[PDB]
Design an enzyme around this catalytic site. Sequence first.
Site, PDB file in Angstrom:
ATOM      1  CG  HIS B 151      -1.805   1.197   1.322  1.00 19.52           C
ATOM      2  ND1 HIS B 151      -2.929   1.337   0.538  1.00 19.52           N
ATOM      3  CD2 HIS B 151      -1.738   2.312   2.088  1.00 19.52           C
ATOM      4  CE1 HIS B 151      -3.518   2.485   0.820  1.00 19.52           C
ATOM      5  NE2 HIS B 151      -2.818   3.097   1.757  1.00 19.52           N
ATOM      6  CD  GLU B 152       1.698   2.593   3.865  1.00 21.76           C
ATOM      7  OE1 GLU B 152       0.949   2.157   4.767  1.00 21.76           O
ATOM      8  OE2 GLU B 152       1.475   3.667   3.268  1.00 21.76           O
ATOM      9  CG  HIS B 161      -6.127   6.224   0.487  1.00 24.86           C
ATOM     10  ND1 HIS B 161      -6.284   6.937   1.655  1.00 24.86           N
ATOM     11  CD2 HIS B 161      -4.917   5.623   0.573  1.00 24.86           C
ATOM     12  CE1 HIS B 161      -5.213   6.778   2.412  1.00 24.86           C
ATOM     13  NE2 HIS B 161      -4.368   5.984   1.779  1.00 24.86           N
ATOM     14  CD  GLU B 231      15.484 -18.497  -9.321  1.00 23.26           C
ATOM     15  OE1 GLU B 231      15.507 -17.268  -9.545  1.00 23.26           O
ATOM     16  OE2 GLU B 231      14.583 -19.058  -8.660  1.00 23.26           O
ATOM     17  NE  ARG B 300      26.712  -4.298 -31.054  1.00 22.59           N
ATOM     18  CZ  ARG B 300      27.286  -5.098 -31.949  1.00 22.59           C
ATOM     19  NH1 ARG B 300      27.276  -4.773 -33.235  1.00 22.59           N
ATOM     20  NH2 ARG B 300      27.874  -6.219 -31.559  1.00 22.59           N
TER      21      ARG B 300
HETATM   22  C1  LIG Z   1      -5.153  -1.186  10.473  1.00 23.30           C
HETATM   23  N1  LIG Z   1      -5.724   0.178  10.434  1.00 23.30           N
HETATM   24  C2  LIG Z   1      -6.238   0.627   9.276  1.00 23.30           C
HETATM   25  O1  LIG Z   1      -6.646  -0.094   8.364  1.00 23.30           O
HETATM   26  C3  LIG Z   1      -6.298   2.172   9.147  1.00 23.30           C
HETATM   27  C4  LIG Z   1      -7.789   2.569   9.070  1.00 23.30           C
HETATM   28  C5  LIG Z   1      -8.049   4.098   8.974  1.00 23.30           C
HETATM   29  C6  LIG Z   1      -7.277   5.047   8.418  1.00 23.30           C
HETATM   30  N2  LIG Z   1      -7.838   6.253   8.529  1.00 23.30           N
HETATM   31  C7  LIG Z   1      -9.006   6.170   9.162  1.00 23.30           C
HETATM   32  C8  LIG Z   1      -9.997   7.116   9.539  1.00 23.30           C
HETATM   33  C9  LIG Z   1     -11.161   6.676  10.227  1.00 23.30           C
HETATM   34  C10 LIG Z   1     -11.325   5.297  10.526  1.00 23.30           C
HETATM   35  C11 LIG Z   1     -10.330   4.361  10.143  1.00 23.30           C
HETATM   36  C12 LIG Z   1      -9.155   4.795   9.450  1.00 23.30           C
HETATM   37  N3  LIG Z   1      -5.582   2.593   7.904  1.00 23.30           N
HETATM   38  C13 LIG Z   1      -4.268   2.431   7.654  1.00 23.30           C
HETATM   39  O2  LIG Z   1      -3.464   1.914   8.434  1.00 23.30           O
HETATM   40  C14 LIG Z   1      -3.816   2.942   6.269  1.00 23.30           C
HETATM   41  C15 LIG Z   1      -3.086   4.289   6.445  1.00 23.30           C
HETATM   42  C16 LIG Z   1      -2.597   4.913   5.121  1.00 23.30           C
HETATM   43  O3  LIG Z   1      -3.391   5.424   4.339  1.00 23.30           O
HETATM   44  N4  LIG Z   1      -1.280   4.848   4.914  1.00 23.30           N
HETATM   45  O4  LIG Z   1      -0.725   5.367   3.777  1.00 23.30           O
HETATM   46  C17 LIG Z   1      -2.875   1.916   5.571  1.00 23.30           C
HETATM   47  C18 LIG Z   1      -3.511   0.529   5.364  1.00 23.30           C
HETATM   48  C19 LIG Z   1      -4.311   0.505   4.056  1.00 23.30           C
HETATM   49  C20 LIG Z   1      -2.444  -0.566   5.327  1.00 23.30           C
HETATM   50 CA   LIG Z   2      20.462   0.829 -30.178  1.00 20.05          CA
HETATM   51 CA   LIG Z   3      13.396 -16.598  -8.834  1.00 22.88          CA
HETATM   52 ZN   LIG Z   4      -2.496   5.200   2.277  1.00 19.52          ZN
END
Ligand SMILES: CNC(=O)[C@H](Cc1c[nH]c2ccccc12)NC(=O)[C@@H](CC(=O)NO)CC(C)C
Ligand SMILES: [Ca+2]
Ligand SMILES: [Ca+2]
Ligand SMILES: [Zn+2]
Lengths: 426, 426
Positions: B151-152, B161, B231, B300
């Site tokens: 995701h990051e 998002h 491999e 080349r």
């Molecule tokens: C495990 N916790 C979650 O899923 C929370 C949920 C959340 C974020 N903002 C909110 C506002 C209101 C209610 C819930 C939330 N989201 C995240 O950790 C996400 C944060 C993000 O956008 N990182 O870039 C990254 C995730 C997708 C791995």
């Molecule tokens: Ca070339």
């Molecule tokens: Ca491999």
């Molecule tokens: Zn995010």
Amino acid sequence: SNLTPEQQRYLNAKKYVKLFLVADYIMYLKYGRNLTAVRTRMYDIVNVITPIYHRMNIHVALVGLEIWSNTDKIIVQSSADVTLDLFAKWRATDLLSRKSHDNAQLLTGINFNGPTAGLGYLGGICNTMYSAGIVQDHSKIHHLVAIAMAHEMGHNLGMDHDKDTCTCGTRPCVMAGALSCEASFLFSDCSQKDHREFLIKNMPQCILKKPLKTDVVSPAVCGNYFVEVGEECDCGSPRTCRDPCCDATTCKLRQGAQCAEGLCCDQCRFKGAGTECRAAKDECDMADVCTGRSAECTDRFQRNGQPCKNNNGYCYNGKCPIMADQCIALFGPGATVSQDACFQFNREGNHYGYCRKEQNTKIACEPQDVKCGRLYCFPNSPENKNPCNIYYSPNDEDKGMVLPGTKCADRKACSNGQCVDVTTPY
Amino acid sequence: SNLTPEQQRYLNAKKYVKLFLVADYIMYLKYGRNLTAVRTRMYDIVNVITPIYHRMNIHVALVGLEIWSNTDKIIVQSSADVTLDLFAKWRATDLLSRKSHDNAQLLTGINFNGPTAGLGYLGGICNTMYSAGIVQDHSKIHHLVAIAMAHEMGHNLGMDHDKDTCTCGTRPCVMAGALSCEASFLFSDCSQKDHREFLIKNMPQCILKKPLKTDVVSPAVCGNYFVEVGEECDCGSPRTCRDPCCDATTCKLRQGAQCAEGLCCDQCRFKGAGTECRAAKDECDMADVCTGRSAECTDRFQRNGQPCKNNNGYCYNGKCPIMADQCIALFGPGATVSQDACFQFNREGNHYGYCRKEQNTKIACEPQDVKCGRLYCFPNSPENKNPCNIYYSPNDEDKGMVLPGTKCADRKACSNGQCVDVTTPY
Ligand SMILES: CNC(=O)[C@H](Cc1c[nH]c2ccccc12)NC(=O)[C@@H](CC(=O)NO)CC(C)C
Ligand SMILES: [Ca+2]
Ligand SMILES: [Ca+2]
Ligand SMILES: [Zn+2]
Ligand SMILES: *[C@@H]1O[C@H](CO)[C@@H](O[C@@H]2O[C@H](CO)[C@@H](O)[C@H](O)[C@H]2NC(C)=O)[C@H](O)[C@H]1NC(C)=O
Ligand SMILES: *[C@@H]1O[C@H](CO)[C@@H](O[C@@H]2O[C@H](CO)[C@@H](O)[C@H](O)[C@H]2NC(C)=O)[C@H](O)[C@H]1NC(C)=O
Ligand SMILES: CNC(=O)[C@H](Cc1c[nH]c2ccccc12)NC(=O)[C@@H](CC(=O)NO)CC(C)C
Ligand SMILES: [Ca+2]
Ligand SMILES: [Ca+2]
Ligand SMILES: [Co+3]
Ligand SMILES: [Zn+2]
């Protein structure tokens, strides 16, 4: 019906699990060395565990909390098994030595080897060296960590893992051997049974004692069915509340009402002083009376020395300690008291045969105090070829000794390794 | 709405992401001070990421792993926002200076405030100051930690998002705002488009370079879509593998196969020698041809010296380096090469004006090698009052100097801080 009056009376008795949570060093670090955060994390987990166990007629009460912020007090390691063991031992010699609690759970930030997210001794509840459990703060969702803790606690309370057939609804149950964010906060019909049977067969005493409002260290939560400091009564949420004496919205008594729940409270008013609240259960129990100005109703027992069990003993703080029942508790059914001649081995003041241990030495029983030292039993079996048999314990030399107050003769009982008269306050 | 040659050419190019992972001290303790465990953790995570991003023509390759088993290099706080900044700056300062990589991710066992489980700069891929992200090892299930990292990294790749209008099936997608423990390993239709647009309007070059099999610090894995040491090919897992030339089980070419990947590889066979495998992109490029005995297609170019840019420069390794464009690169549009007189400051041999370094000293330019030292430009802004301007990086002093092969004098170019003739092999 098949259950003894005591068993049925035990099951009907409201249950309380005075819990003592412990957060390890990694938990402290995991939450930015912020004791407030760690503490709050635990509080929440409890707010999820409590409502869960309510459906089991059991109220989990956080009577203590410890955060190993300066350093761990046990070698918490990836081995969930070892961690549990070490945690239990620590809990038996260290914690229980300074804080009384029914069950303790370790919340660690460490990662246990394998998929396991926690461990808990089966049926160990109330037990000094087994009423414990460990849980890994495996998910960011505290609701899931709580379930994990409820699971471990579930084991402590005699519950096992749900088998394919077991069900509690359309989703997994707390005792499901595997987690998932689709897990519910319900126990399967199996767990319900396992628990019941466990209770019936063992009847762990500790879970009967209600903690004092002050013993609870968790922030009072109005609606959790437990009256905590700052509250006057708790009948749950306004929607579920069934007590007219209480205002489920603010956890306060309603105008006029003096009390809400209790054996000495009728129609929101203190029962008249002198009115009986609890009848006598046994020939050593004394019917309890209401003070009229209070909501509770303390329990009182007959005065020690009162003949009980067909003149086979004398009441002792509510109980009727018989030398016969003690043998049945040490060796099991069929066990009986060894003949007099056997107790003469107490006059030897040897390693096992003695009456009192003044300092650390062993004083041989006086010729007339023999039946007050080591208890000699004889399992009434066509095999045993030994009339005299004692129950020794390397850990506690007192274990196996005739309990105090045990009728050692006519109108006499053992006080302190001596057969004294039961006509003197003891 | 149309696509330029360079854009389409870029889009088609196979993309690589040389990832560098960093584990904090808590991770170290969280896994019982077991480096093998911590590495394994990071390895498992990359094993889930790779297949996710391959569907995006992106080959993730772990080219570095640093575990802060002794002490954290930055102050990892519960504040994700502050940690992302501290780490992003640490990387741009300490990390990049020690090892080259396209993007770094900080995997920490610390708990971030609020629901946040990770963070990563938007479209910061390849950027020395923003191609970073922080992920919390929040779940015990490495699968969810992988989606978190993916995701990051997604953000780093210009992805944002998902809106309620975006889908990737029934399950939520990687770029889902909320992380469900039922989250899939797919990217939403929106995610995929934003990505394309990002690449088109940016074209981050670093992800075009393939990592040498010897740069991958991660243990060879037959199925990670990356031909590592030992491999011959890797069409992914034996279950998903669709390549009719590779034995997904052993990562070996099948019988009758000479290759499985390459512009000069068709239907498991080497394209006949002579066949064209790449056209000339510019005037300094030469159409490339297959050797017939190889799957690769060496790119080349024209011999260094070929006149280019309307006779303003001479080809140099496939490029036509001319001060005209250099200035624009250093000081943006409008920026034009300053007048001859300025370059005279290179004879100065001082702090900035020179032609080349010996070690710590700088060999000043000579009357002719003058236009081969520090490049002098000037903004076309009316408010400008200085004819001689310079780009200087205290970090790297080479930055700002004239590019090699850059047409200095008439028929000569810069070789080594000297304006040598173009006729001589430079
Ligand atoms: C495990 N916790 C979650 O899923 C929370 C949920 C959340 C974020 N903002 C909110 C506002 C209101 C209610 C819930 C939330 N989201 C995240 O950790 C996400 C944060 C993000 O956008 N990182 O870039 C990254 C995730 C997708 C791995
Ligand atoms: Ca070339
Ligand atoms: Ca491999
Ligand atoms: Zn995010
Ligand atoms: C320790 O953690 C607590 C929360 O666990 C932090 O306090 C919270 O601060 C936010 C504001 O940013 C409030 O909205 C919350 O209500 C607070 N929580 C509560 C109820 O205590 C606290 O700041 C942390 N300690 C520090 C200063 O790092
Ligand atoms: C250090 O961590 C590694 C895990 O990376 C442990 O190795 C595992 O050992 C178990 C057996 O208990 C095996 O089932 C796993 O397959 C092993 N994992 C791998 C792939 O290495 C190792 O035992 C740990 N060492 C200590 C001191 O606990
Ligand atoms: C987050 N981890 C989990 O959900 C694993 C899953 C698991 C355990 N054994 C397995 C064998 C095959 C496949 C999966 C598992 N289970 C646990 O942590 C449970 C362990 C347990 O029963 N402790 O008493 C406690 C839990 C219910 C809180
Ligand atoms: Ca309450
Ligand atoms: Ca009584
Ligand atoms: Co590929
Ligand atoms: Zn279990």
